[PDB]
């Protein structure tokens, strides 16, 4: 295995906070990003 491999993951896990187009990226304790922007939708006579 890569000697520093896991260490890299840790740095990639907690640092985050890069401010780009999608907003603010910050991975949670087990992977998938958290605090994403969502838009609610409703159907209205075959419309969105």
């Amino acid at each position, epitope marked *: 295995i890569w000697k520093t491999g896991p260490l890299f993951k840790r740095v990639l896990m907690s640092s985050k*906070y*890069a*401010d780009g187009v999608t907003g*603010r990226v910050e991975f949670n304790e087990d992977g998938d990003r958290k605090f994403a922007n969502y838009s609610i939708m409703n159907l209205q006579n075959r419309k969105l």
Partner: antibody
Amino acid sequence: EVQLVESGGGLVQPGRSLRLSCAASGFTFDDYAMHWVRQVPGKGLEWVSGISWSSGSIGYADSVKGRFTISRDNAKNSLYLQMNSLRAEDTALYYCAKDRASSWYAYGMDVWGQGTLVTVSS
Amino acid sequence: NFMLTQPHSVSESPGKTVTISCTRSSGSIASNYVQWYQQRPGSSPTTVIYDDNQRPSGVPNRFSGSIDSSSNSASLIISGLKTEDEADYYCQSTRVFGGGTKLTVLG
């Protein structure tokens, strides 16, 4: 919104120690990093030091390397600069300014403060 | 490293467009980024141009930033308007600031 205040400047004889404190208000303190930049009367400005978003990534210049120390406390939203064993050519202003990204490798600055006056002379 | 060199000062009558540039001594000018800062005398500097050619929020347009290779320099072509907007300007690339040029409105 983004307002920065700095304090702690005054007349200091050479060889003594000083500590400046910069308080901030408005924006969230846990998302951005800040630098400390200084001018020179008549001359331009020069980079001194810059802190990371939380800690760790500390940037130092050549002359200031080792002499100074920079730290921050995210709980009270303030920056602290401690200086000891100064020199006569380090008498100038000092600006507490915030960056744009979440680090300092970009060397970004936006919405600065107002400056202080630290003089090292006999 | 390198030394960012710019002319000491420029002055023009109101109503004319003027270009202000600083020249990179060594290396490619476009290899890094260049930003421009405006500071009224006595007061504190504020952002006017960041990230090559980008206008920060609150800037009322009317500003342009050219980073053409030319003779290894980047310039701003500011259109004709004087009012009270005439102060010292600085250009910064990486940890290195410009010499310092100020605009003078002719009286």
